[PDB]
Amino acid sequence: IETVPVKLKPGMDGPKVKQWPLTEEKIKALVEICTEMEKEGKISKIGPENPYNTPVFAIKKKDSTKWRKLVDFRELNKRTQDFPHPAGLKKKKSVTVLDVGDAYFSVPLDEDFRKYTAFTIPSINNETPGIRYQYNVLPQGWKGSPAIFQSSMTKILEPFKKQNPDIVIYQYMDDLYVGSDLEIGQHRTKIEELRQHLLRWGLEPPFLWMGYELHPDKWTVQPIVLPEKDSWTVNDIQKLVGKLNWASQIYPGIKVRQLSKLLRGTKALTEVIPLTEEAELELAENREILKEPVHGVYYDPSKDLIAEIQKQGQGQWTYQIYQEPFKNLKTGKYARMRGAHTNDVKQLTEAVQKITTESIVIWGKTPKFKLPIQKETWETWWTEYWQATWIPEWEFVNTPPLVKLWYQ
Amino acid sequence: MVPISPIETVPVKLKPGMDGPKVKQWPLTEEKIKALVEICTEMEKEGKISKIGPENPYNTPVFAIKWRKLVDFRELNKRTQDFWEVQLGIPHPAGLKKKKSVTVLDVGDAYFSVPLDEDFRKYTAFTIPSINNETPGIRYQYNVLPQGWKGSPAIFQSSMTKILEPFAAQNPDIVIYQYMDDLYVGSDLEIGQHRTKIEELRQHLLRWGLTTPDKKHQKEPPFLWMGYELHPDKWTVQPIVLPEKDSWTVNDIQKLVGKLNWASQIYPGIKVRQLSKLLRGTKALTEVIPLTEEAELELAENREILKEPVHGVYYDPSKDLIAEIQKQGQGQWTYQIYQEPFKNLKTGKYARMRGAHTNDVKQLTEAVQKITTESIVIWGKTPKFKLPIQKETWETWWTEYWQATWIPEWEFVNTPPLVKLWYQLEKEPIVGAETFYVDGAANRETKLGKAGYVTNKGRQKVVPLTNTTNQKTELQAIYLALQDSGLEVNIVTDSQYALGIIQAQPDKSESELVNQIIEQLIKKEKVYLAWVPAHKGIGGNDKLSA
Numbered sequence: 001i002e003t004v005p006v007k008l009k010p011g012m013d014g015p016k017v018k019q020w021p022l023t024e025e026k027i028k029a030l031v032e033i034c035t036e037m038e039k040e041g042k043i044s045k046i047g048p049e050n051p052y053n054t055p056v057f058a059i060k061k062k063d064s065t066k067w068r069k070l071v072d073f074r075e076l077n078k079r080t081q082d083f084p085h086p087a088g089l090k091k092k093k094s095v096t097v098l099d100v101g102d103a104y105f106s107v108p109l110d111e112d113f114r115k116y117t118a119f120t121i122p123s124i125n126n127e128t129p130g131i132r133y134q135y136n137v138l139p140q141g142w143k144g145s146p147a148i149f150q151s152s153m154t155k156i157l158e159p160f161k162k163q164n165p166d167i168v169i170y171q172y173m174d175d176l177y178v179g180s181d182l183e184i185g186q187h188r189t190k191i192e193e194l195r196q197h198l199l200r201w202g203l204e205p206p207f208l209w210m211g212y213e214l215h216p217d218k219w220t221v222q223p224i225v226l227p228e229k230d231s232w233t234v235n236d237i238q239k240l241v242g243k244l245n246w247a248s249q250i251y252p253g254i255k256v257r258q259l260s261k262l263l264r265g266t267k268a269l270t271e272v273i274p275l276t277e278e279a280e281l282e283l284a285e286n287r288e289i290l291k292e293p294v295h296g297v298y299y300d301p302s303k304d305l306i307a308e309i310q311k312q313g314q315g316q317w318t319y320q321i322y323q324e325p326f327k328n329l330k331t332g333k334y335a336r337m338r339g340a341h342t343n344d345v346k347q348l349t350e351a352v353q354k355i356t357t358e359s360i361v362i363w364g365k366t367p368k369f370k371l372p373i374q375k376e377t378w379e380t381w382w383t384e385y386w387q388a389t390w391i392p393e394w395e396f397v398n399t400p401p402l403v404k405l406w407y408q
Numbered sequence: 409m410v411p412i413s414p415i416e417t418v419p420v421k422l423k424p425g426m427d428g429p430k431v432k433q434w435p436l437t438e439e440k441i442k443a444l445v446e447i448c449t450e451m452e453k454e455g456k457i458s459k460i461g462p463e464n465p466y467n468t469p470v471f472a473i474k475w476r477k478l479v480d481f482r483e484l485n486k487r488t489q490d491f492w493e494v495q496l497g498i499p500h501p502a503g504l505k506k507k508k509s510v511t512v513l514d515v516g517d518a519y520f521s522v523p524l525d526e527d528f529r530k531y532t533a534f535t536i537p538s539i540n541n542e543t544p545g546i547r548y549q550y551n552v553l554p555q556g557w558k559g560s561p562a563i564f565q566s567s568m569t570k571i572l573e574p575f576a577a578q579n580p581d582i583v584i585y586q587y588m589d590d591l592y593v594g595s596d597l598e599i600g601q602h603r604t605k606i607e608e609l610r611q612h613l614l615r616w617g618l619t620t621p622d623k624k625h626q627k628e629p630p631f632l633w634m635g636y637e638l639h640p641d642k643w644t645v646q647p648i649v650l651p652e653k654d655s656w657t658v659n660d661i662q663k664l665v666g667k668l669n670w671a672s673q674i675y676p677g678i679k680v681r682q683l684s685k686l687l688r689g690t691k692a693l694t695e696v697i698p699l700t701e702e703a704e705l706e707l708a709e710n711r712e713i714l715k716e717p718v719h720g721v722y723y724d725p726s727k728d729l730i731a732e733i734q735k736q737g738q739g740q741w742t743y744q745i746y747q748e749p750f751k752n753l754k755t756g757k758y759a760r761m762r763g764a765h766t767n768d769v770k771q772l773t774e775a776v777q778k779i780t781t782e783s784i785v786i787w788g789k790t791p792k793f794k795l796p797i798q799k800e801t802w803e804t805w806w807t808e809y810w811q812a813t814w815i816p817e818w819e820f821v822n823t824p825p826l827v828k829l830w831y832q833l834e835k836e837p838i839v840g841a842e843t844f845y846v847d848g849a850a851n852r853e854t855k856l857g858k859a860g861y862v863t864n865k866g867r868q869k870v871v872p873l874t875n876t877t878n879q880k881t882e883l884q885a886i887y888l889a890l891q892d893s894g895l896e897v898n899i900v901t902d903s904q905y906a907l908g909i910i911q912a913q914p915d916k917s918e919s920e921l922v923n924q925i926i927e928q929l930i931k932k933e934k935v936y937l938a939w940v941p942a943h944k945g946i947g948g949n950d951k952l953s954a
């Protein structure tokens with residue numbers, strides 16, 4: 001009810017980010033949403049004295065038919081002033097993600113900072129002036145919101161935590177992650193118990209009823225594996241030596257000397273080469289090395305997480321998360337990419353969101369993505385398939401990696 | 409007297425850390441001073457300016473031009489905050505809807521009913537010099553937005569919009585658009601109902617004390633606006649006239665391309681590649697340049713396209729948008745957007761991006777994304793595409809390409825030249841095909857090198873090379889293997905560089921060597937390219953680096 005003073009970082013001005021083009025349906029959804037928010041006092045119209053801007057669009061959360069406003073505060077968040085992650089969350093058998101972002105609207109925003117939350121609802125073909133608003137309350141997606149609302153959330157959650165001490169509750173931006181070990185039916189009733197426990201405080205939230213269910217305990221380690229074959233061709237051995245050479249950047253004691261000595265001569269690629277005793281032993285020793293963890297791998301909260309993704313074909317995608325090259329903190333593979341059997345970009349967009357979710361659960365922050373896609377293609381489509389209330393950072397890969405072959 | 413509603417003032421600030429202007433008034437002739445004194449007396453009477461005391465420390469120079477008054481706000485403008493500028497994105501005519509009637513209202517006097525933020529007025533101070541400098545100069549400050557001041561256009565437009573919003577909202581059967589000192593009001597209503605709407609608008613504006621000329625506006629359809637001609641049921645660009653000349657100058661060509669680019673939004677098939685090529689690297693505006701034979705053709709082709717008027721139609725929201733693309737050659741692409749056959753809303757073009765290697769499919773994809781984004785802007789939706797690429801071709805491409813890629817709903821249209829895939833590498837080694845182990849190396853100092861191969865059949869070649877590099881020799885080695893092999897071939901290289909290029913699947917390159925390789929790939933039936941790491945004792949695969 002009383003506002004927290006908030007400031008931008010030293011020597012830095014507010015965001016001036018262009019509104020990107022919106023479809024008719026998203027414009028109409030935003031006009032409807034903002035008209036209601038304006039009546040509720042959550043936002044107010046602004047004048048030309050405010051030159052700041054942040055992009056806005058609208059999405060449909062997974063399994064819903066109600067449009068949700070999504071502000072892209074990435075620039076503002078970088079420019080905003082700065083204000084312990086639970087290692088147990090990723091170990092729970094079920095985690096339900098709640099959208100609690102609506103709660104932030106109950107807290108007023110510092111009068112002097114509001115101008116920096118300016119956004120624009122554009123018109124088709126710019127035929128009428130864009131509708132200009134700023135926030136009067138903590139906005140969804142702004143990093144300052146969870147920080148300012150934190151004392152309030154803890155108070156709301158106290159009785160539920162007291163009565164359920166083994167439940168892990170973790171907040172990231174507008175998301176609430178609720179983890180327990182258990183049977184699912186009971187789990188869903190704690191989540192519902194939680195819900196009602198929050199509704200009480202409110203007295204209605206459009207998306208609180210929703211539950212996004214995860215099972216991070218089912219997530220795990222994906223290591224390097226070598227083929228097991230009875231007949232090796234020249235091509236098979238060349239591929240094996242290539243993979244091992246690559247793996248030797250990750251694992252010290254990998255050797256290819258004896259295997260390479262099978263590749264001596266100038267043989268037809270499809271010709272079968274019997275393994276020598278020396279070559280099989282080297283191969284066996286390499287297998288054993290690859291069963292061990294990578295050495296000197298640690299997470300540092302002061303460094304960025306980086307996520308790389310490869311398209312493997314047939315709807316399959318591989319990814320790695322690291323801070324230092326060759327020191328992967330997590331690797332994984334997605335073989336489904338549902339609903340995008342004929343759409344690469346939708347598949348990639350879902351992969352990005354899934355990887356970000358894993359990252360939030362494990363380290364409590366989002367990675368910077370290296371995306372195997374041309375900038376123009378991504379920028380034109382990702383908002384059509386986006387279903388999360390946060391947005392990570394990304395860059396684009398224009399040169400095909402050889403590494404793709406090693407994660408196949 | 410009838411009470412009128414005041415216009416809300418916009419609070420204005422100087423940029424952080426900056427003070428107002430303190431600029432010296434230039435001397436003026438006795439004649440100019442008298443002119444300014446009378447002008448300002450009238451403005452003072454009109455309430456636009458007010459005399460101020462000697463305490464104000466700010467000043468902006470004023471001039472007299474042959475009289476009229478000019479206040480030079482360049483310094484104050486530098487010191488004034490940034491504003492939201494709504495006009496940055498202008499409507500494209502192809503997105504407009506047709507109208508039976510469009511009326512113009514003059515609102516030029518309304519502009520001076522906009523008051524200036526009281527606290528900012530002090531910064532607008534100026535001084536009329538006194539005759540012979542024997543008395544203190546007459547000091548004035550503005551009470552209304554000054555012409556030439558940075559904030560005036562944004563504040564004026566926002567103030568007018570705010571006034572017009574309730575009228576537009578309660579009268580959805582009309583459209584209202586402001587440009588300069590005019591309001592344009594369009595509708596599809598019966599003329600009697602439409603004229604009634606205009607009088608109601610005039611009555612609405614009166615509430616803010618804003619008067620509009622009873623005498624009808626002189627401007628009437630067609631309208632000359634932002635380089636376009638707007639008619640009730642069609643639009644075009646203003647006349648495009650290509651000059652006759654015996655000699656062309658950098659500047660002339662820049663101006664030519666500009667007109668052609670402008671023309672290209674409704675004249676189909678405009679091309680500018682060869683003319684733009686003449687501008688490469690050099691920017692000496694007076695330097696005459698001889699036209700290539702290719703540039704002369706391009707220009708001749710464009711003159712023919714422009715020989716007579718072409719018009720676009722307006723947008724009908726009750727119908728689909730269709731976008732059709734053609735390949736023109738040399739990285740050039742052209743398109744038309746229409747709802748009904750033979751009636752374009754607009755046209756346009758796309759050019760290949762600068763880069764080392766490329767292929768037609770990638771370019772087609774890029775053009776599609778450009779048109780998609782343009783269409784979201786203009787119409788708020790994606791058009792149904794008609795593309796010169798077979799469905800089977802597209803499927804092979806995107807399923808095998810290492811990047812994610814997507815094209816929205818589209819259909820094949822069979823009009824040459826068709827976009828196709830010119831080669832496809834094998835996924836597995838070819839049984840029965842000769843295996844070529846290739847390599848090359850060069851010396852960095854003397855730039856001498858070698859490229860060659862050895863095969864399972866005992867075939868061998870080494871070629872000595874001059875003026876070369878490691879990367880070129882690696883490509884040359886692959887080229888030799890392609891040249892000297894049969895229709896099916898397995899090729900083994902250690903070149904990460906060469907792998908990175910072919911895996912990008914180029915069909916054309918800035919490297920003639922790569923182009924030679926592409927021409928060879930096109931002639932093969934089957935080609936499997938295998939990579940191995942260098943210097944690891946692999947057979948066949950380097951010593952021959954000697």
Ligand SMILES: Cc1cc(/C=C/C#N)cc(C)c1Nc1ccnc(Nc2ccc(C#N)cc2)n1
Nearest residue numbers: 499504505507583585592629631633638639640
């Ligand atoms: C953007 C715009 C520029 C001018 C430009 C005014 C000037 N100068 C005039 C108007 C009225 C508008 N606004 C809109 C909005 C929707 N459909 C249209 N269609 C439309 C506009 C003019 C003519 C004509 N003749 C026909 C159809 N105009």
